[PDB]
Amino acid sequence: ILKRYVPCYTESFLLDIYLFEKIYVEIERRIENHNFLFYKDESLVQLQDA
Amino acid sequence: ISSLELYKYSIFFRNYIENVAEDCLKNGLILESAAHNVSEVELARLKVQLKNALLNCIISYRFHGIGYVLVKTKDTLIDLEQPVNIELPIGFEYLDYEYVRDLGVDFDHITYKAVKIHKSRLIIYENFDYILKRYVPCYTESFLLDIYLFEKIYVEIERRIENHNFLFYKDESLVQLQDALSSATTSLSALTQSNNNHSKDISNLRNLNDSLSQELARLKSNLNNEGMFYTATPSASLEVIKYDLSYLKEALALIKAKIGADTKEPLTRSFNEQAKGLGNDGKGDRSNYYDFLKGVQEQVENSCNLKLTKYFGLDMKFNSLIMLSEEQKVERDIKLIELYSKYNQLIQSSSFNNEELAMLKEKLFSF
Amino acid sequence: SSATTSLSNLRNLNDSLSQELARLKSNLNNEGMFYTATPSASLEVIKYDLSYLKEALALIKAKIGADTKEP
Amino acid sequence: FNSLIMLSEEQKVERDIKLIELYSKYNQLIQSSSFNNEELAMLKEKLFSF
Amino acid sequence: ISSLELYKYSIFFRNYIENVAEDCLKNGLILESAAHNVSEVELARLKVQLKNALLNCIISYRFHGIGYVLVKTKDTLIDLEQPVNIELPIGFEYLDYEYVRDLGVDFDHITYKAVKIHKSRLIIYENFDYILKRYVPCYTESFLLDIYLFEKIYVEIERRIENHNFLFYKDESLVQLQDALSSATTSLNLRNLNDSLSQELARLKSNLNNEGMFYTATPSASLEVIKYDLSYLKEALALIKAKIGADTKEPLTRSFNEQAKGLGNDGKGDRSNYYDFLKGVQEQVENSCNLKLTKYFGLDMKFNSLIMLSEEQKVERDIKLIELYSKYNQLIQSSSFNNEELAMLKEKLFSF
Amino acid sequence: ISSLELYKYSIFFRNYIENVAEDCLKNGLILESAAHNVSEVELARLKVQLKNALLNCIISYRFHGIGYVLVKTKDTLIDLEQPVNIELPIGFEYLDYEYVRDLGVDFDHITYKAVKIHKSRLIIYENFDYILKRYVPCYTESFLLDIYLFEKIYVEIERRIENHNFLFYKDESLVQLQDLSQELARLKSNLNNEGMFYTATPSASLEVIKYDLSYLKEALALIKAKIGADTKEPLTRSFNEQAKGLGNDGKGDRSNYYDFLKGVQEQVENSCNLKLTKYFGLDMKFNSLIMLSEEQKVERDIKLIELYSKYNQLIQSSSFNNEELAMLKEKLFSF
């Protein structure tokens, strides 16, 4: 049908493998700061900006 | 939706197309000569080439709607036009659909690439739909749409994988002071464009975004160091924006249901989770895939033997779809021997009339 | 939008504007943090649903099973 | 290529036992039957092992 | 991510590396001499040293991609360069990868630390990938990332264990007076304000401990418990376990030491993936050793069977075989089959 | 994280260290003399002392990475430097790691506390890692961190047990009293009396402040998973809930702990017999890890007797050729 020699895999299969790896890539990207503190204060910025 | 593009992109479509042919030629063929003069080695080589041609023939039948196998004999390239009365073929060669021009059944020749070949040398396997009055493939527009959606789900997954979770930060700091000066300057410059310190506005914008990048780097640095994000503005806000996948999950469920409804191939329906169901269960309740394969095999046998026997003196047969194991064969032999022993005992130790024994003979399957 | 309307001096204007917009967008997208300066700015995820189609598929399967005898 | 399915020693012994039992049953039937020659021959082809 | 650093820090990586070698040499080897002249005691000692060398050889093969075992003979340190025609080895010594310099297969010598050693005295176990055209270890960057995340989960757990729950207190009291004056004037006595603030905080803490009631004066005072969460780390652990199980075939590594090696006898030919992997590794090691042990040293090595039968299993198999022989004898004695038929039965029978 | 401090504080670490040695020497040893001249009583006493030394040897091997056992003979303290050709040992004594100075394998002597001892009188059990090119213990930094977190969970539990629930109260007239305070505490006692807390201020507030433990529960689950992944000792993995798995199941599918113990026993046997046979004429062996019960022995004997009876019946009532019978003999395991 394609009139050419082809491997055993296709673009969709490559995409599936790439997503399989990208999941843990993202996990590593957001593992360190999964939980953090958001603090709002005016006197403390009176200190920090100085 | 283009069938060729879908075939190139998706391996699932390729497997769906090729599985039927592979299963049909899994168990092999039996080749015989009417004259009983050809040696078995040459006939076996002919059978091997016939299987090789038939695989591509069935693949082309499923993809395009027609498949052509040329029966190569000891003749010149110009002699292909002439008909054949009786000959022993040298081999079989599958002909590409794109290089074959056929004007219909009313004609007895085709053009191959421009060599004219008589139809008596060609094995034709066609799927003609009388309702549509045309040759059609094994798939339809709805099936193509189902496959396209199946791929598009993971296309979208790749599109939104990287930024599935991110931070939305609103801050009225020194940064917003710069940004608001920038915004007012850009709005006034837009008014002037619709109609001059716009260069000053540009230099602003540039330095302002430089400072913005610096401040964002500092904020991220603080976040990484002490795990605390601090801000000055009492109206500052920080919210996590998240994506969702329930739509795609439900769509996958529906698409799997549609594919299972739209095809009979067990691997395609079950996503390679179910078996082909071509085993021996000791019962006559065969599977739908078995019935489909039997019909395809019967059609292929008819197509081949329409011209192999008439013009070439050869007969082809398909091997049995169900293959018995050695243990099953031994068990069947044991049961048959027990049946014969029981019949012999009854005959020896009975005084039935001859007519009654004969009548029992016909009503017995084995005897 | 006014620029595009006029297209459907100005060269330098559009080059500077495009440079600034592209850099701002690129920074906000790359840092994995969407920043804005407007106190009234809003960002919301809009999502679709499929329960209607799932229930419709169930009902349609029931109707087909009732309407035909072919297993 | 070697056979994909490799039988274990116990499986080989079991198969040998079953085959020996089949042969014993065939011998008993032949010795204690009075079937015609044509009928016995016809049984031979329809039997897989014989 | 550094493989050496991960090996130093994590015991899981070390176990993953060493389990395959330990399983391969669990059941032992068989050593034989072609000449049939070496005494069995000396050959057994040689086998012991060979096993000791092969363990480190396989470990180096998995970690670096190549492993070197020197076959020590009765020769001087300078004689290692000279080739060997026929000799009986004195022993086997594993060579460290970091001290071995090899220029490729086109060369027939290596440098060890600078002693030149001919390749005919060396057992080389290498993993060459033709697609990559280089020697590669048994692990990849994704696997290293998985292990790193597996450790980083508990790193984060340790980071946030101490202050998982704490109190957030807002109070416009004398304490806020003190801290506001401190803020303003430090941005610009104060140490006395410091002392008073600390004193009042300790007093309120003491009150809390004493009477189990925290009291405050300010109508706008607030007290809220701030808490952390672990669902992210739990889900990440699940995903990481799935990835590790997908990325390796070693059952202990996949199951976190929860599953067995699956190297028992089930009476069926359906062997396990770990069994197939170990058989392939053993075949490669056997080929690598016997390529030069037989040609240059007249020695042959074999691996013991991976599946070891128990005494009860042996007795059961013997009983079944004796029953089969008895049935065959009975059939032969009480049958009248033709000679050709009996012969044909003989070939189609496995045991006979 | 300090391994010594963790060992001092936590009994779990101590049990993890000592369980392997206890299991290895649970079933005992077998001691033999090549000359066949030593009486069995003296050899049994030597075996007892050898077991006592080997326990501490294995413990030191796991904790530090090397273990030393001195083979004491009939010699003076200065004669330890001299090598030994052939002698019968008087006993075995484990040597503390902290008092032993060894410069490496290139040297044939050590210093003990400063007595110089030749290496021919010492049984050395070492764990050398060729990748790291150094002696390493059986634990790593991650394992130490896991144990530390396991203890820190209950440390935090103790920190917040007393004030898990308390009252937050806001009132203005009451602080007019406070800034009297003990008298309002007495009014809280009157609350305890009458079951009703009453206040004056329309803006007075009373709220129960509560703590939570889901974080620690989830952390305990994750830590248990990590420990199970990081060690092979069944008791350590299962928190003393699973058995050692060293029984007899009638199958060759042994356990991971059995394989680990067998490897450790083989290493110990090699280390001991490298010098017991060469310099002292003694051989040591470990008892079988799997010990059969009396009923199992009787059942095995019954099965073997049945097998022999079947073989005898086949031989008596068969007419097989001599070559066929011989060929059956090799293919039979028992015969």
How far is the alpha carbon of E187 from chain A, nearest alpha carbon, in Å?
6
Query: In D, what residues contact B, Cβ < 8 A?
Result: 15, 18-19, 21-22, 25-26, 28-29, 32-35, 43, 46-50
For E259-308, the DSSP string reads S----S--SSS---HHHHHHHHHHHHHHHHHHHHHHHHH-EEEEEPPSS-
The 8-class DSSP code of residue E134 comes to E
Give resolution in angstroms.
10.6
Q: Which spans in chain B are helix H? A: 3-9, 11-24, 40-63, 141-160, 174-194, 198-226, 246-262, 266-270, 288-312, 326-348, 354-363
Alpha-carbon span B12 to B61, nearest angstrom: 18
Residues E117, E81: contact at Cβ < 8 Å? Answer: yes
With beta carbons under 8 A apart, name residues in chain D contacting E333. Answer: none
Radius of gyration for the alpha carbons in chain F, expressed in angstroms and rounded: 33
Residues F23, F59: contact at Cβ < 8 Å? Answer: no
DSSP three-state, residue B69 = strand
Alpha-carbon span E198 to E192, nearest angstrom: 10
Residues F268, F54: contact at Cβ < 8 Å? Answer: yes
How far is the alpha carbon of A28 from chain B, nearest alpha carbon, in Å?
12
- Give the H or E element holding residue B67: strand B66-72
Alpha-carbon span F221 to F231, nearest angstrom: 16
Give F29's strand partners.
F286
CA proximity to B253, closest of B141, B143, B149, B156: B149
CA proximity to B71, closest of B342, B364, B303, B322: B303
Burial class (CB in 10 A: 0-12, 13-18, 19+), F196: exposed
Contact E324 D20 (CB under 8 A): yes
Closest partner CB to B154 (pick from A19, A33, A40):
A19
The tokens describing B72, both together, are 């190569």
Around Cβ D40, how many Cβ atoms within 10 Å? 13
Name the phi and psi angles at F135, rounded to 5: -80, 130
Residues D17, E323: contact at Cβ < 8 Å? Answer: yes
Residues F20, F233: contact at Cβ < 8 Å? Answer: yes
The 8-class DSSP code of residue B118 comes to E
The tokens describing E97, both together, are 């990868």
Smallest CA–CA distance from E171 into chain F, residue: F170
The 8-class DSSP code of residue E222 comes to E
CA proximity to B237, closest of B184, B170, B286, B293: B170
The 8-class DSSP code of residue E80 comes to G
Alpha-carbon span E245 to E256, nearest angstrom: 9
With beta carbons under 8 A apart, name residues in chain E contacting F149. Answer: 154, 157-158, 161
Residues B147, B17: contact at Cβ < 8 Å? Answer: no
Q: Which conformational region is residue E4 in: left (phi greater than 0), alpha (psi within -120 to 50 degrees), or beta? A: alpha
Subunits with 3+ C-beta pairs closer than 8 A to C: B
Alpha-carbon span B134 to F199, nearest angstrom: 93
How far is residue F271 from each of residues F45, F68, F266, F285, measured CA to CA in Å?
A: 21, 11, 9, 12
DSSP three-state, residue B76 = coil
Burial class (CB in 10 A: 0-12, 13-18, 19+), A3: exposed
- Give the H or E element holding residue F157: helix F141-160
Burial class (CB in 10 A: 0-12, 13-18, 19+), F180: exposed
Alpha-carbon span E134 to B310, nearest angstrom: 60
Q: Report the Cα–Cα distance between both ends of chain D, in Å, rounded.
A: 28
The 8-class DSSP code of residue F169 comes to E
Alpha-carbon span B271 to B255, nearest angstrom: 12
Contact D18 B327 (CB under 8 A): yes
Residues E229, F215: contact at Cβ < 8 Å? Answer: yes
Helices (H) and strands (E) in chain F, counts: 11, 12
Residues C34, B169: contact at Cβ < 8 Å? Answer: yes
Alpha-carbon span B220 to B231, nearest angstrom: 12
Strand ranges (DSSP E) for F153-281? 165-170, 205-210
Around Cβ E60, how many Cβ atoms within 10 Å? 26
Alpha-carbon span B262 to B143, nearest angstrom: 7
- Give the H or E element holding residue F91: strand F91-95
Residues F137, F13: contact at Cβ < 8 Å? Answer: no
With beta carbons under 8 A apart, name residues in chain D contacting B333. Answer: 22, 47-50
Amino acid at E38: V
Residues F137, F62: contact at Cβ < 8 Å? Answer: yes
Alpha-carbon span B66 to F3, nearest angstrom: 77
The tokens describing B210, both together, are 């430089």
Breaks (C–N over 2.5 Å) after residues, chain B: 113, 195
With beta carbons under 8 A apart, name residues in chain E contacting A50. Answer: 187
Query: In D, what residues contact E, Cβ < 8 A?
Result: 5-13, 15-17, 19-21, 23-24, 27, 31
Alpha-carbon span F232 to F261, nearest angstrom: 10
The tokens describing E151, both together, are 């450790």
Closest partner CB to D16 (pick from E269, E337, E349):
E349
Mutate to test the interface with C, among B201, B216, B219 (most CBs of C within 10 A): B216
CA proximity to B197, closest of F106, C13, F252, F134: C13
Angle at B225 between CA B221 and CA B230, to 5 degrees: 70
Alpha-carbon span B102 to B126, nearest angstrom: 12
Contact E351 D12 (CB under 8 A): yes
How far is the alpha carbon of D13 from chain E, nearest alpha carbon, in Å?
7
CA proximity to F239, closest of F231, F247, F248: F231
How far is residue F323 from each of residues B338, E322, E349, measured CA to CA in Å?
A: 36, 16, 18
Alpha-carbon span B232 to A49, nearest angstrom: 9
Alpha-carbon span B331 to B318, nearest angstrom: 25
Alpha-carbon span F14 to F10, nearest angstrom: 7
Amino acid at B38: V
List, as own/partner pairs, every contact residues B250-256 make where C-beta atoms lie below 8 angstroms and the sequence separation is at least 24, other chains included: B250/C50, B250/C51, B250/C53, B250/C54, B251/B149, B251/B153, B251/C50, B252/B150, B252/B153, B253/C54, B254/C50, B254/C53, B254/C54, B254/C57, B255/B146, B255/B149, B255/B150, B255/B153
Query: In C, what residues contact B, Cβ < 8 A?
Result: 2-3, 6, 10, 13, 16-17, 19-20, 23-24, 27, 29, 31-39, 41, 43, 45, 47-51, 53-54, 57
With beta carbons under 8 A apart, name residues in chain D contacting E350. Answer: 7, 12-13, 15-16
Radius of gyration for the alpha carbons in chain E, expressed in angstroms and rounded: 35
How far is the alpha carbon of A19 from chain B, nearest alpha carbon, in Å?
7
Burial class (CB in 10 A: 0-12, 13-18, 19+), E205: exposed
| Sole residue written with tokens 């539990």 | F157
Smallest CA–CA distance from E226 into chain A, residue: A37
How far is the alpha carbon of E152 from chain F, nearest alpha carbon, in Å?
10
- Give the H or E element holding residue A46: helix A43-48
Alpha-carbon span B252 to B258, nearest angstrom: 10
> Please, do chains E and A touch (3+ CB pairs < 8 Å)?
yes
Give the pairing of strands B228-231 and A37-40.
Answer: parallel
Alpha-carbon span F117 to F27, nearest angstrom: 32
Radius of gyration for the alpha carbons in chain B, expressed in angstroms and rounded: 36
How far is residue F169 from each of residues E197, E204, E214, F183, measured CA to CA in Å?
A: 21, 13, 6, 16
With beta carbons under 8 A apart, name residues in chain C contacting B167. Answer: 32-34
The tokens describing F29, both together, are 């040893």
With beta carbons under 8 A apart, name residues in chain D contacting B334. Answer: 21-22, 25
Alpha-carbon span F92 to F71, nearest angstrom: 5
Residues F283, F276: contact at Cβ < 8 Å? Answer: yes
Closest partner CB to B250 (pick from C33, C38, C54):
C54
Give the pairing of strands F134-135 and F128-129.
Answer: antiparallel
Q: b vs e for F89-128, b when ≥16 Cβ sit within 10 Å of the residue's Cβ?
A: beebebbebeebebeeeeeebbebeeeebebbbbbbbebe
Alpha-carbon span E231 to E244, nearest angstrom: 20
| Sole residue written with tokens 């974080």 | F215
With beta carbons under 8 A apart, name residues in chain C contacting B253. Answer: 54
For E206-217, the DSSP string reads HHHHHHSEEEE-
Q: Which conformational region is residue E6 in: left (phi greater than 0), alpha (psi within -120 to 50 degrees), or beta? A: alpha
With beta carbons under 8 A apart, name residues in chain E contacting D20. Answer: 324, 327-328, 331, 349
